[PDB]
From a paper:
[name] family proteins contain a conserved N-terminal kinase domain and variable C termini. The kinase domains of CDKL1, CDKL2, CDKL3, and CDKL5 were crystallized using a phosphomimetic Asp-X-Glu (DXE) substitution and in the presence of identified inhibitors. The [name] structures all contain broad spectrum ATP-competitive inhibitors that bind to the kinase hinge region via 3 hydrogen bonds.
Their binding was stabilized by a collapsed P loop conformation that establishes potential allosteric sites for inhibitor design. In CDKL2, the ATP-binding pocket was sterically occluded by the P loop and activation segment (αAct1 and αAct2). This forced the αC helix to swing outward, breaking the salt bridge between the catalytic lysine (K33) and glutamate (E51, αC). First, the MAPK insert folded into a single large αG1 helix and loop, whereas MAPKs typically contain two shorter helices for recruiting the substrate Asp-Glu-Phe (DEF) motif. Second, the CDKL2 kinase domain was extended at the C terminus by an unusual αJ helix that occupied a site equivalent to the MAPK common docking (CD) groove and, thus, occluded part of the recruitment site for the D(ocking) motifs of MAPK substrates. Interestingly, the packing and orientation of the αJ helix was distinct from the C-terminal extensions of other kinases, such as PAK1, CDK2, BUB1, and NEK1. Notably, deleting the αJ region reduced the activities of CDKL2 and CDKL3, whereas CDKL1 and CDKL5 were largely unchanged.
Numbering used by the authors: -7 to 11, 14 to 308
Write the structure that this text describes.
Amino acid sequence: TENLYFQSMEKYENLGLVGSYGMVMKCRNKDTGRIVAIKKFLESDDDKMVKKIAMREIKLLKQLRHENLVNLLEVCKKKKRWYLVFEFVDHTILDDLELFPNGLDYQVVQKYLFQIINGIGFCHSHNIIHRDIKPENILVSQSGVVKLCDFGFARTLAAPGEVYDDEVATRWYRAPELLVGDVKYGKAVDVWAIGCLVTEMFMGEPLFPGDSDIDQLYHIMMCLGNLIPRHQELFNKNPVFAGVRLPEIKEREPLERRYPKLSEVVIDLAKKCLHIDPDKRPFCAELLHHDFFQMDGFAERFSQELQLKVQKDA
Ligand SMILES: Oc1ccc(-c2ccc(-c3cc(Nc4ccc(CNC5CC5)cc4)n[nH]3)cc2)c(O)c1
Ligand SMILES: [Cl-]
């Protein structure tokens, strides 16, 4: 079955390159009519140890089955190349943000955020750090079901140049530990990224839109103050930053000063996610029990709502 063995690509037709997401093809199932999204995973099966490691990744995808994650449907082979087949979701959060220049309605933000935190939380409990949270990487169904894509397979088989392209593309959402070169980052980098989406979704403005990694740090520190000493040490030892000094800042512009209309509950949520010290950020499950989701029983009501959406939407 679609779970047991490699399937064939004969039943698929190409419909233009999806997206952003590397080489991800939009295809249609000739037999079912189902529209799908196909990514090229392996170039060559030949390397015996390589294949060994690919099966390790595929096995993990098949175990990351969740309502708020794009589903891997099947794996196909053609010649020496392997292709992962994912579901095709209607649109992205970025698409909604471009229709709504003043930000999203409060309840739409609650529903999108709750789902994002839920999907990320599941990743963390399976020892996966998503590392690529941004509006374009968060898909939305016609029924409003959020689905996270792009977490691990393509990134491992990637060039030093693809690593570099990724870091540039996610620049605005990268936590300070990443920007200074901490290679022992943890799950907390996703929480930071979620923090970034809070004010963006409400205000229709990116939070820290820097032009470079030094400029990114500057935007972060102007709002949130000095980096922790561990981060300063990494910065000073990082060849990327040779001849560059960390921002000194006389005047901090705190978040509530920048967005004085935002309620204290919303500000509190963002600040929790945006701790400069990643140890001080909450974990995902704690976030879902913030007042922002719990006032007027939103989280409870919405969990039931979401379960019916999911079952009739799929
Ligand atoms: O390792 C990987 C690599 C790639 C993916 C991945 C899986 C699925 C998708 C995907 C994207 C997508 N839908 C989509 C993507 C972009 C747009 C933006 N254009 C708007 C519609 C006009 C709209 C819809 N459906 N499925 C994208 C990437 C993945 O899940 C894991
Ligand atoms: Cl859909």
